[PDB]
Point group: C3
Chain length 330, copies 3
């Protein structure tokens, strides 16, 4: 009747429409197993006082040569050369500057944490004096990295990203490079959301940009881009219709006030032996943008069990539907 039939049709609408055709309640799910390969192409040019006219290619600016699922691109740096294990004068810092040996306590760390103080106080320059430490010497100088960044050419760098996934449960496998697409295209390809959406080759600047940030800006102090690949698939539909979605997100905090060590930089070195048999190194403090490819899928496919489950839920629900509807009238 008005109470029974109406309510019945209503719950029908709820399940079929809402829980089923809408929310896919008739499906069983699986999540993604994933493998990512990246390849960066490009060259940066630098001109520098104390350096020269210089090329930086993929071996120079990718560090290390591979991280599984992510790559770090060198954008900026501070470079200290001809360091050797020795003693030298600490950089002036309130705690660094010293009048005499009383101020320098041997065996203790330093403000920077780049040396160990020999109690001896030594003169930094003709004007100053500061604690002597044992370290790689001379110490890196306290300075900000250059603005604009030395490796700015990197905005123009390109990264091929190959990603293959599989859903173990459903035995389905797919590649992020789709069947239609041909090799030559992929010689000349560059990803474009409008023109070339199926091109796996992305431009560094375009990723930053696409994330509503700017390469050059972000490139002085460094930072972290997430490149998110999403495989959501209804495996009832054509395999063809199962495709990756790319989104881009800057991961690190731009707020200088709520964090520590903003941007992205790390120290790493190059070691040489001067022919004497004596070791010397070059310390680089690099900044850049780490890119994290991040892949997450979910697939789903028709299954009796959950279907029937939901149905039973509906049937049990209508019982209460009649009461709730009845007492709802006047």
């Amino acid at each position: 009747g008005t109470l029974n039939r109406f309510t019945q049709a209503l719950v029908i609408a709820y399940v079929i429409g809402y829980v089923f055709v809408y929310n896919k309640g008739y499906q069983d799910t699986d999540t993604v197993l994933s493998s990512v390969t990246t390849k960066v192409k490009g060259i940066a040019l630098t001109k520098t006082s104390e350096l020269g006219e210089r090329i930086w290619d993929v071996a120079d600016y990718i560090i290390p040569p591979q991280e599984d699922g992510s790559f770090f691109v060198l954008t900026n740096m501070i470079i200290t050369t001809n360091q050797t294990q020795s003693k030298c004068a600490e950089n002036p810092t309130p705690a660094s500057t010293c009048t005499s040996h009383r101020d320098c306590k041997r065996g203790f760390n330093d403000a920077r944490g780049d040396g160990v103080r020999t109690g001896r106080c030594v003169s930094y320059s003709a004007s100053v004096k500061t604690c002597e430490v044992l370290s790689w010497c001379p110490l890196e100088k306290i300075v900000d990295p250059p603005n604009p960044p030395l490796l700015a050419d990197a905005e123009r760098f390109t990264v091929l990203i190959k990603n293959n996934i599989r859903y173990p449960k459903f035995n389905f496998n797919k590649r992020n490079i789709l069947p239609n697409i041909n090799s030559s295209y992929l010689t000349h390809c560059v990803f474009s959301r409008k023109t070339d959406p199926d091109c796996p080759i992305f431009r560094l600047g375009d990723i930053v940009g696409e994330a509503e940030e700017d390469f050059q800006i972000m490139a002085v102090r460094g930072g972290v881009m997430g490149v998110q690949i999403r495989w959501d698939c209804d495996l009832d539909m054509p395999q063809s219709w199962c495709v990756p979605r790319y989104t881009f997100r800057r991961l690190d905090n731009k707020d200088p006030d709520n964090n520590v060590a903003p941007g992205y930089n790390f120290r790493f070195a190059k070691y040489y032996k001067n022919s004497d048999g004596t070791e010397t190194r070059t310390l680089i403090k690099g900044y850049g943008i780490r890119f994290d490819v991040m892949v997450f899928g979910q697939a789903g496919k028709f299954n009796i069990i959950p279907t029937l489950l939901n149905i039973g839920a509906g049937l049990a629900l209508l019982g209460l539907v009649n009461v709730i509807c009845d007492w709802i009238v006047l």
Copy 2:
């Protein structure tokens, strides 16, 4: 009756048999937290014109020394030595070869993307002329990597793989090396699907092979093996019965026509200072096989809530069972 009792027994069979004892509908689930360590043992020998009789050990052929959860094995290479930052003649390519300086536009990239053109056109050889670029010099030569691959000895290399997992929800922990197994065995152990299934030490060639590929073949141009470890566990049963399953899959596309940059290769370098204080490097373009250990578990254990849920679903379902069965007769 014939309608009621029969249907009742039928749905009983469906739930108990199908949704429960079959499909495990009485269980609650958790997924794996995982840690992987790998250790490669072996030595490769090479003999080469322009090189010599040479050894390559783990420090030489694993690059870099560690990636979390995966390792790259060096199989092939192209090696350019005594490069220094300088200018030189580009390699002949349709765009490379030049008659005069008009053809070379200063400040622009090159076909390879290994240099920046100074507008000056310089003669490659007595016969040819091509654009001058600033780069690490001399340039790597355009050539294919050697066939058969230099590091073929790597087929015979061995990798210990230790994998420890935990299911946070169920508090259960396990190691991929099982309790029975003893240390000496693990001195001499090599994984065998027939004889030694519980041996964590796998042979590179055997992984490739087990994946229905061939090391040597795959080793010229490089590539990617997935080593898949699966922990599916019914935590109702003995902990003893919770074990890893190993499968092996080549991840990259063998089709040359549907992709870019087939196989696996990357560039990386060794930097030296000639005693003058002058820098020089050796560029290696390596090929090899990256191995991705990929671990995915699911554990499940009895829970009242889902059990009862399913039951209710059944009871609600039978109501419709009577109607559907009745109207199904004649």
Copy 3:
């Protein structure tokens, strides 16, 4: 009645109390997408016969400079210098020691697997003789790493850990550094479970320790710490209440008898060119502690579908509740 009303109230208690307010059956779930950055600060000092008074900073002791989501800290090492590709005498091992060339079969591997035997037998020392091999020479000596470990200063090292997460389904994002916390605090901050629970800067020793292990002990042979971050969130509640939980677990087996290659060590090298144009390297076998940051969240939020589902389950269940209760009396 006594049968009907009582049972009704009982199942009500079961669902509302147990399946709902207790077990959160009214919620829908999502799991974590995660990004981790780590930064190690500190300096180690070493004094050694055959070495000197020496500093080791972050470039020296972090290897390689970055792994995505985990870092390896150098604690101990065995160091072999001025190796060059050449031939030399193998280390005495039952299989190593040889009386004459019959005992040395050319072209075959060795016990250590660091060389290839030229059939020639050569005298190790004035006293002994052993097989000649082609290798980097001289060979690393068979010895245990030093006790106590050279890099013990590392116990005192500190690691900033930044972790940003997002739940794609619920669009919620959060950082492991919380809004209240201010920069200066994070200059001086060190994580403390009692005093400073919201400090992202952890002390290596304190992590080991917190895991009921000891840095120094674990530091001779190396090993693996899991640093587990857990984001469990009810997204019904305040975003404020969504926070990370840190736990710490040693991942590797301390049992020497049930495994292979205990602790954590790997080989890696430094390559130099002696001015002749001749290559030489330094082989380091390092030990240390790899730290794996491991992040797993689950978020949940109210949803009609599962709520109603469970309800229906309840209603269907009570039907059986009446029978089970009735037949339960006398």
